[PDB]
């Protein structure tokens, strides 16, 4: 997380950390608990190549990484079939946990939005994660979960910004319709934040508007962060995840 502060213990109970085997179960991506048996993440975290599940664990909402870990096994990885690369789109995946989570005050699910929800600028949005603090700059120990309020930008506005100082033809779309834009040069998500949630307050409830996906650098001029538009893939999520 570029910009922003350390999250309070209470806030973001749906936040998960994806782990990879090694000298330790190291953090490599974020995700969200959307159901007691399902975690929503970015496809690029776990694809396009098929991954061995022995090498993956899920860690539920805790303040710091590695201090109070209880690693949960994953039983299935479901990557959107249309996914190849983040810039192409369909950077969304589901992890089915081997055991259901008994939801509490500190650990519970995030609400998905209705299809009708557009998430226009002005919306109070927040992105959360344990990823990079700046370009090629890791989150230092004790690894606190970070949060940052990011401004929502319209797709065509964002797409126009992406073309500034780029050879790509103006008629050639960069920010695709399954994508969403948020951030500036001071507030943004970064590498290691992927799969993590972009949540917005809509009539007193937190709804996940996006999934941390890609962007050119981290909090770079005319390069807002690109997130997966959750509304676009609701039908796919709900083919697997109970309503």
């Amino acid at each position, epitope marked *: 997380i570029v910009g922003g502060q350390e999250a309070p213990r209470s806030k973001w109970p749906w936040q998960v950390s994806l782990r990879v085997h090694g000298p330790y179960w190291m953090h490599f991506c974020g995700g969200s608990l959307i159901h007691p048996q399902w975690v929503l993440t970015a496809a690029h975290c776990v694809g396009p190549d098929v991954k061995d599940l022995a090498a993956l664990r899920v860690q539920l909402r805790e303040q710091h990484l590695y201090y109070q870990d*209880q*690693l949960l*096994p994953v039983s299935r990885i479901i990557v959107h079939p249309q996914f190849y690369t983040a810039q192409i789109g369909a950077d969304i995946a589901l992890l089915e946990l081997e*055991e259901p989570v008994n939801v509490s005050s500190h650990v519970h699910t995030v609400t998905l939005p209705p299809a009708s929800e557009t998430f226009p600028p002005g919306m109070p949005c927040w992105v959360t994660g344990w990823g990079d603090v700046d370009n090629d700059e890791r989150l230092p120990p004790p690894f606190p979960l970070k949060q940052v309020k990011v401004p929502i930008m319209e797709n065509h506005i964002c797409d126009a910004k992406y073309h500034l100082g780029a050879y790509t033809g103006d008629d050639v779309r960069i920010v695709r319709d399954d994508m969403l834009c948020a951030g500036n040069t001071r507030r943004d998500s970064c590498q290691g934040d992927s799969g993590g949630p972009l949540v917005c307050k809509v009539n007193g409830t937190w709804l996940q508007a996006g999934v941390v996906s890609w962007g050119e650098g981290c909090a770079q001029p005319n390069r807002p962060g690109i997130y997966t538009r959750v509304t676009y893939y609701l039908d796919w999520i709900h083919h697997y995840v109970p309503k």
Partner: antibody
Framework: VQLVESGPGLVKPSETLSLTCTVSRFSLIGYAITWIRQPPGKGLEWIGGISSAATTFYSSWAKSRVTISVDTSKNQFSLKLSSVTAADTAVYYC????????????????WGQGTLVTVSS | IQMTQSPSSLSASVGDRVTITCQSIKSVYNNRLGWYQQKPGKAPKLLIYETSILTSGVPSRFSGSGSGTDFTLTISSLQPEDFATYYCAGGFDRSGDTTFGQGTKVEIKR
């Protein structure tokens, strides 16, 4: 990489078999340990197991009289089988599921050497 | 929900193709089917896992095939060392519906 079963070789009937699965020169934090037994000359039978998230799963039989636990600070797994009969005389194995499952059997990559437990007066 | 191995025991000459089938009435959960080789007085060895994936170091003469309810362990060219009891083991759910097959005793014909 080694898994080691430890415990009494001879147990009198009605008593409780207590075994430990100790895991040398390797931290098995994200892993699961399941216990399997094999009556002499007979085949493999699942007792139960503990998941990556310290969740216990016990087989159809046993459920009532079996207890599996973890001592993270010693890197040990326990098995306690109460009210033993000559039907419990077997070779006791502890094996690892590298996916940290707890109720799996299809991918037990590391195994212990096996420990013979004879239930007799 | 148990698993049936066929045959219960077989005898084959060196270099022969050996086929051991494992079959269930309920379908296997998520390709959750592994093959074990147990030589007398030794702990079982995982040869094949997740239906067809071969454990590293295990000879290429061992292969696994199948899906759902019917599976097969194949020994393309049986070697004298391949004498052992072979057990399949599967999962039908994530909360305790897992068993081992009765096992098949493979014996060399000389």
């Amino acid at each position: 990489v080694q898994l080691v079963e430890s415990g009494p070789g001879l147990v009198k009937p009605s008593e409780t078999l207590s075994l430990t699965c100790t895991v040398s020169r390797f931290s098995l934090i994200g892993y699961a340990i399941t216990w399997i037994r094999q009556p002499p000359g007979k085949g493999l039978e699942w007792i139960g197991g503990i998941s990556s998230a310290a969740t216990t799963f016990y087989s159809s039989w046993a459920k009532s009289r079996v207890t599996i636990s973890v001592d993270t600070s010693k890197n040990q797994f326990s098995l306690k089988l109460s009210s033993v009969t000559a039907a419990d005389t077997a070779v006791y194995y502890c094996a690892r599921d590298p996916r940290g499952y707890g109720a799996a059997l299809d991918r037990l990559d590391l195994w212990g050497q096996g420990t013979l437990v004879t239930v007799s007066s | 929900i148990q698993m049936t191995q066929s045959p219960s025991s077989l005898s084959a000459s060196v270099g022969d193709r050996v086929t051991i089938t494992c079959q269930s009435i309920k379908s296997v959960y998520n390709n959750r089917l592994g093959w074990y080789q147990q030589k007398p007085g030794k702990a079982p060895k995982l040869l094949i896992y997740e239906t067809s994936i071969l454990t590293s170091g295990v000879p290429s003469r061992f292969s696994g095939s199948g899906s759902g309810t019917d599976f097969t362990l194949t020994i393309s060219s049986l070697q004298p060392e391949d004498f052992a009891t072979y057990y399949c083991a599967g999962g039908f759910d994530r909360s305790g519906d897992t068993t081992f097959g009765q096992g098949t005793k493979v014996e060399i014909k000389r």
